[PDB]
């Protein structure tokens, strides 16, 4: 080999409704191409690409090797999820920090450092849920187990204007609210 | 104490 | 294409040759649980508190790289496949928190479309390499089998400063420098 090649393998565990449902895929990738793979739904190794045929049959031709793989759905997925994940991942709750700052002006509500990803931010003008003139960034992954999202409200500051950024997140027993007046 | 995490095991393709 | 409540990637083995460059990690919902330092043979948890509640035998990561290295050797010889193109990485710089002058914050350099996963991401404060208060993540996998990686620079926001995320990659015919400054505002 004088040329640079990238080989990649991974074991993906898809959970839905907790462990109630568990699909398990194993993927072998070469030079950016998936060639062989094991899907729990298919029950055995399949040649994703042609270069994979030799291997799909080859591994399916080794009873325990192929029977250890089918068991990884229980050995790895179910086991990792029901144990370690429940004490770490599944219980991490970081309370989003919420602040409003100015930008015919725009109000920007910064929702930051929260976890998990699930979140709903809403703007209110005089206790009324504003929906027009609102826009949000996509969910921003900080890569350190926290996310952030910026939500803007385009508006016309009418004296007696009460604008409220409303944030609902699982880490919050009670929705957060930050208010901003033309005064402030 | 600590709950161990298990990983998938990549299979060897014959040489 | 496959939907779910959660995705647990338990075992990601990346290997490159020539160079015997390997990387082993565990991901959950797109974040890094830990990576096994292949030289120190140690499981390094991204979140220290997670490491105190769960553990992982670095051996499993070592076994994984063993197999993956073998397989590659086989494929590199069993095929006449042409080496994939060096993609040009793309970087974006943004602050972890809303910038506030003189208040400690964190500049994040998000680098995507990295391929192959070999790169130098460095920080510059006023055109000068910053060595301290810098942290880097492992190579995260992408659906298209390229990778992304983030770098973090701890800093104190000030308009007198201009920062730069400097990316060096085989697919760039010159180091790319993404600029950022609170002064842009
Ligand atoms: C998911 O919720 C519970 C999990 O125990 C399960 O009993 C129920 O059948 C599921 N409901 C659906 C289909 O969403
Ligand atoms: C990365 O930086 C090193 C110096 O530490 C240099 O030798 C190498 O060529 C760089 N790799 C590239 C171009 O990605």
């Amino acid at each position: 080999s004088e040329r640079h090649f990238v080989y990649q393998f991974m074991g993906e565990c898809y959970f839905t409704n907790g462990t109630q449902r568990i699909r398990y895929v194993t993927r072998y990738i070469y030079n950016r191409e998936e060639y062989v793979r094991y899907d729990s739904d298919v029950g055995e190794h399949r040649a994703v690409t042609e270069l994979g045929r030799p291997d799909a049959e080859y591994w399916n031709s080794q009873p325990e090797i192929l029977e250890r793989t089918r068991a990884e759905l229980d050995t790895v997925c179910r086991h990792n999820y029901e144990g370690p994940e429940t004490h770490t991942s599944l219980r991490r709750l970081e309370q989003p920090n919420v602040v409003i700052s100015l930008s015919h002006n725009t109000l920007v509500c910064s929702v930051t450092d929260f976890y998990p990803a699930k979140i709903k931010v809403r703007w209110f003008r005089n206790g009324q849920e504003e929906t027009v003139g609102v826009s949000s960034t996509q969910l921003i992954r900080n890569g350190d187990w926290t996310f952030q999202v910026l939500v803007m409200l385009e508006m016309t500051p009418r004296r007696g204007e009460v604008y409220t950024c409303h944030v609902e997140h699982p880490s919050l027993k009670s929705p957060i609210t930050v208010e901003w007046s033309s005064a402030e | 104490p600590v709950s161990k995490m298990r990983m998938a095991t990549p299979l060897l393709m014959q040489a | 294409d496959i939907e779910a409540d959660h995705v647990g990637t338990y075992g990601i083995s990346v290997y490159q040759s020539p160079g015997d460059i390997g990387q082993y990690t565990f991901e959950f919902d797109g974040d890094e649980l830990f990576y096994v330092d292949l030289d120190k043979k140690e499981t390094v948890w991204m979140l220290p508190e997670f490491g105190q509640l769960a553990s992982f035998d670095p051996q499993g990561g070592l076994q994984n790289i063993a197999v993956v290295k073998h397989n590659l050797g086989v494929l590199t010889k069993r095929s006449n496949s042409t080496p994939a193109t060096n993609e040009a990485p793309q970087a974006t710089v943004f602050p972890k928190s809303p910038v506030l002058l003189g208040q400690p914050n964190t500049l994040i350099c998000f680098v995507d479309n990295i391929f192959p996963p070999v790169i130098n991401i460095t920080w510059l404060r006023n055109s000068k390499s910053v060595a301290d208060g810098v942290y880097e993540t492992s190579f995260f996998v992408n659906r298209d089998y390229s990778f992304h990686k983030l770098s973090y620079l701890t800093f104190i926001p000030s308009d007198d400063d201009i920062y730069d995320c400097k990316v060096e990659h085989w697919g760039l015919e010159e180091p790319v420098l993404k600029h950022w400054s609170s002064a842009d505002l």
Side-chain angles (χ1 to χ4, degrees), chain A residues 1-117 119-184, chain B, chain C:
Chain A
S1 185
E2 214 207 317
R3 300 168 249 60
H4 192 68
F5 273 104
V6 172
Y7 187 109
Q8 167 183 160
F9 161 83
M10 52 203 294
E12 317 184 309
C13 292
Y14 299 95
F15 309 106
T16 316
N17 181 353
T19 41
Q20 293 285 298
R21 190 186 181 191
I22 297 174
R23 180 165 181 178
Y24 174 58
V25 186
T26 266
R27 305 179 190 276
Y28 296 69
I29 297 71
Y30 175 61
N31 192 55
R32 298 198 70 177
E33 229 131 48
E34 182 189 4
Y35 67 107
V36 65
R37 152 224 302 174
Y38 164 82
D39 185 318
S40 66
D41 284 1
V42 170
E44 40 163 59
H45 292 56
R46 279 289 196 305
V48 177
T49 205
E50 67 297 301
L51 223 186
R53 291 187 166 83
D55 315 303
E57 266 185 287
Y58 187 38
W59 298 321
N60 282 332
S61 298
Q62 296 179 56
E64 181 139 300
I65 271 189
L66 165 289
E67 210 149 79
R68 191 187 56 186
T69 296
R70 302 177 188 176
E72 300 192 312
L73 183 153
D74 208 66
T75 299
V76 182
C77 302
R78 185 183 305 290
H79 166 63
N80 281 332
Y81 185 119
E82 311 201 310
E85 298 303 350
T86 48
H87 297 57
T88 55
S89 286
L90 304 171
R91 97 186 195 61
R92 172 179 181 62
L93 289 179
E94 287 301 302
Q95 289 193 191
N97 278 11
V98 189
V99 62
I100 291 173
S101 69
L102 192 75
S103 185
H104 182 197
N105 298 64
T106 303
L107 281 184
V108 178
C109 186
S110 295
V111 186
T112 59
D113 298 334
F114 60 91
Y115 191 99
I119 201 161
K120 160 201 172 193
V121 180
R122 301 185 313 176
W123 274 106
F124 281 82
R125 178 174 157 61
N126 298 162
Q128 307 302 298
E129 180 188 57
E130 186 70 336
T131 280
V132 292
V134 179
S135 70
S136 179
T137 66
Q138 295 195 281
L139 181 60
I140 297 164
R141 180 181 300 283
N142 297 316
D144 60 349
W145 292 81
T146 66
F147 299 89
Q148 65 178 290
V149 61
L150 321 172
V151 178
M152 295 180 118
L153 171 60
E154 261 246 326
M155 96 292 200
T156 60
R158 292 181 185 287
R159 304 191 60 58
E161 67 295 293
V162 194
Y163 296 108
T164 308
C165 180
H166 180 274
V167 171
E168 288 166 323
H169 186 261
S171 79
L172 290 172
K173 205 164 173 179
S174 320
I176 296 184
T177 69
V178 177
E179 276 167 52
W180 183 93
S181 299
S182 183
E184 313 184 316
Chain B
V2 294
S3 199
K4 301 182 179 181
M5 292 194 80
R6 302 172 191 169
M7 77 316 266
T9 310
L11 307 180
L12 294 164
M13 55 197 274
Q14 78 170 65
Chain C
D1 197 303
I2 306 178
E3 64 181 57
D5 272 43
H6 297 290
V7 179
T9 315
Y10 303 127
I12 297 180
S13 310
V14 182
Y15 191 87
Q16 309 171 66
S17 57
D20 250 297
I21 309 174
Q23 180 191 275
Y24 189 77
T25 53
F26 255 48
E27 284 186 29
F28 191 82
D29 278 8
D31 283 294
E32 180 192 283
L33 279 168
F34 62 68
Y35 70 79
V36 176
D37 189 313
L38 308 183
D39 308 310
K40 299 171 66 181
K41 279 70 171 177
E42 161 176 282
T43 300
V44 186
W45 289 79
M46 185 170 275
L47 296 186
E49 61 257 60
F50 274 33
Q52 246 70 187
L53 324 190
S55 55
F56 177 69
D57 188 334
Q59 176 46 47
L62 300 176
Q63 196 197 311
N64 254 252
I65 301 302
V67 176
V68 144
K69 180 185 180 183
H70 172 63
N71 289 8
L72 169 39
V74 172
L75 283 177
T76 180
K77 303 174 184 180
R78 177 203 290 182
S79 67
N80 46 343
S81 304
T82 177
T85 301
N86 286 336
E87 292 291 314
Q90 329 188 186
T92 310
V93 177
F94 56 94
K96 175 181 169 58
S97 299
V99 172
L100 289 176
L101 283 292
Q103 297 307 299
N105 205 317
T106 303
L107 264 189
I108 294 171
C109 184
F110 175 80
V111 174
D112 217 323
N113 191 59
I114 296 183
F115 188 88
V118 177
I119 194 174
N120 294 309
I121 304 174
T122 53
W123 286 99
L124 296 175
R125 186 190 285 130
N126 295 303
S127 314
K128 189 166 158 289
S129 218
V130 174
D132 312 295
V134 170
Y135 174 74
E136 237 195 61
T137 76
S138 297
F139 286 106
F140 290 83
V141 301
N142 287 324
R143 304 287 62 182
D144 76 336
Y145 302 126
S146 70
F147 308 71
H148 73 256
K149 168 197 278 283
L150 302 77
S151 184
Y152 309 82
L153 170 66
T154 296
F155 76 117
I156 300 302
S158 181
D159 294 308
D160 299 309
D161 301 300
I162 52 93
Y163 295 85
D164 282 297
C165 179
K166 176 179 184 171
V167 180
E168 289 174 55
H169 185 75
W170 302 334
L172 296 170
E173 57 176 20
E174 68 174 304
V176 169
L177 288 75
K178 259 294 154 48
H179 121 283
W180 187 95
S181 171
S182 51
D184 287 314
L185 325 181

